[PDB]
Design a protein around this nucleic acid. Sequence first.
RNA 1: AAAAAAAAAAAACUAGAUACUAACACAUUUAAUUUUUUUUUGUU
Length: 128
Amino acid sequence: NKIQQINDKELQSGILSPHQSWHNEYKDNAYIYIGNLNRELTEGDILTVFSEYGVPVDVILSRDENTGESQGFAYLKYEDQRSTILAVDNLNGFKIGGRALKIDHTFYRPKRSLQKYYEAVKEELDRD
RNA sequence: AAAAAAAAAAAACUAGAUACUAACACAUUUAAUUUUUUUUUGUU
């Protein structure tokens, strides 16, 4: 609802196409921070809603090291960037499980401690 | 024929009739800043 507020102003002025859009600030970014998730949505189900706008190559769900349950945020890289422009913009503020999730562009830095979780995820997304 | 040493209207209630006052106020108002509220939970 922070970002959703921008695009309405932006569009209203007829900004139209990325050169003048704030989405142009990125261009080298693909991963999207996916916030305010419900707790029971897992990687496969976050890999349901987000293929509407593109083809995901990677995904990471943030979850506590001990109990292994959702922190409530994920990082999902689309194959073709412009999906990011599309997902952030179009799907932000949308309800799943009662709570309206947040998306925004992100620069994502991998962490050693999950290293195996990368191949374990990749191998499934490497199937396609 | 005379001198008459100067004061009367109401009030209340309820409705109705009509003037009027106060340079009263009348389209601007939005670039620092508080309605910005949630069971904390956004990662070298």
